């Protein structure tokens, strides 16, 4: 699907592709072979699907974090340089591109977020994070902002969360303990509580972007931004007289920015292996080579010992290297993907004040754990990557409270459609089944629950989709109806006043994770002394078998579904009876 005697490359748009392409053109002249350099959007999420097919580029450039999943996926080919070549590079960088004791990617440069500040507006920058909100006011006065950086990507926000506490995948016994990540630790929660403070206290817009912030700082609208070596190239062309210093310090600790190693991976399917090795070792990883690239957009600390000794002189590096030291290297594994999406949501959901910092991180912590076919729920946003799951029968449930509805957008699709692969959005009052053109089309529940089966036999054939919630466009649940739907929990009869709306008894929806049944133990009182009147009925939402409870005391009942609801009789409410108990799950 890729063709021979020619190299294709996917670098990130926010890096020097013009400079690289220049190296490709000198390579094209001396070698005599074509070099094409694309920079497609979302290439981090897209290269997998496209190389997984056997197509994609001959080379790919990305920070070493994603490369472990790519290696695990079988997409990457084993790079095997001579001791003579390996000795020209900081062996620390080789240690970032080594999966299962195999090198999978050529290391190019070490990046890390520094603090960039306008020397003009700000002569001395802040030492602490804590002294910015004061500094914002002191710049609101002058009609300005102290700090603007991308709050969408987590890479940027992470340093402040990880300053005090906050880790991702512990290093225990010289390995990453995937069952033990920091995310929901008081250090992280306090670190994220502070970011939320600044948005709350109107110092940072809850939705700044990279372009927004890159332009706001470059114009001089804002005093500080947070960015890596690639960013300077455009700030330079704004004559801002900008500084690059150490990140400010949270709760006494310094900020801990993740360290990226830009690494150039070679595609499993590439019939041009020999050339890629020839291009990167002989041509790109050379002082003459790396200069060209650093020029268009600065690389920062380079893998090449020879050429890194020079940049070390410029203090923009030194600031970065000093920031690199305070922070930790990026885990070079697959579960990074799970980790990333989990945090991005945790930021967004809680930065959009639709999630408590605790609630957001706790959800994010559990999200970086096992398989994707569990249950999502009580998350404004969410990114379910059901691609290449263990069962190709990946069912997953979403749950917001009453008064809300669920949005859903498919982001990537690698389903067979024809064999029988398809999606399925079963709802209370919704139902949709699809394949074919499901890409980039918005779907909607009409209610607070939603569940999404994925029938696809292709081992790595699954879909990646993002979801959200929205305010009830109409609303029609009569308030008193409550919604409790967790792994397990408490049960209380609701009540209402003698007048209000007597017609229609309240219900109680409890929807749980799929392929799990809900169990109800509960005891009810105040019923008092044909079957009379005033009772409680219970059934699964999509079943007609309703077991009622007439003049009862203690009651036990099991679902045969994730979805369930029990209804309280208009009689039972008018007669003022009450019920309490617990509910649980996990039984298939
Ligand atoms: C789903 O459709 C794909 C189309 O690619 C089918 O793959 C084909 O398999 C048959 C072998 O019986 C041949 O037509 C080719 O090997 C494949 N297609 C092409 C164009 O090469 C696949 O078989 C279908 N799923 C099922 C259930 O068979
Ligand atoms: O989710 C955060 C994101 O962080 C990194 O992306 C960085 C990247 O390291 C830099 O090389 C450059 O591309 O800027 C990005 C931030 O927008 C990880 O490489 C990536 O996997 C991760 O998703």
Residue numbers in the entry: 820 to 1348, 1352 to 1410
What do the study authors state?
In this study, we report the first crystal structure of any C-terminal domains of an ADAMTS family member. The CUB1 and CUB2 domains both exhibit a jelly roll fold with antiparallel stranded β sheets typical of CUB domains. A disulfide bond covalently links CUB1 loops L2 with L3 (Cys1192-Cys1213) and CUB2 loops L10 with L11 (Cys1299-Cys1325). CUB1 and CUB2 are connected by a short linker loop (Leu1290-Glu1298) with the domains aligning in opposing orientations related by a ~180° rotation of the jelly roll structure. The central interface involves six hydrogen bonding interactions between Arg1247-Asn1330, Asn1267-Gln1302, Arg1194-Phe1304, Arg1194-Gly1305, and Arg1194-Asn1330 and a network of hydrophobic contacts. However, the negatively charged residues on loops L5/L9 (CUB1) and L13/L17 (CUB2) required for Ca2+ coordination are not present in ADAMTS13 and bound Ca2+ is not observed in the structure. This is the first structure of tandemly arranged CUB domains that lack the β1 and β2 strands (a hallmark of Ca2+-binding CUB domains) that does not bind Ca2+ (31). ADAMTS13 CUB1 and CUB2 have N-linked glycosylation sites on homologous loops (L5 and L13, respectively). We identified six amino acids (Trp1245, Trp1250, and Lys1252 in CUB1 and Arg1326, Glu1387, and Glu1389 in CUB2), which, when mutated, resulted in the near-complete disruption of Spacer-CUB binding. At the center of the interface, the hydrophobic patch consisting of Leu591 and Phe592 (both L3), Leu637 (L7), and Leu668 (L9) in the Spacer domain interacts hydrophobically with Trp1245, Leu1248, and Trp1250 in CUB1.
ADAMTS13 is a ~190-kDa multidomain metalloprotease (MP) with an N-terminal domain organization comprising the MP, disintegrin-like (Dis), a thrombospondin type 1 (TSP) repeat, cysteine-rich (Cys-rich), and Spacer domains these N-terminal domains are termed MDTCS. The Spacer-CUB interaction is central to ADAMTS13 global latency, and disruption of this interaction modulates ADAMTS13 function.
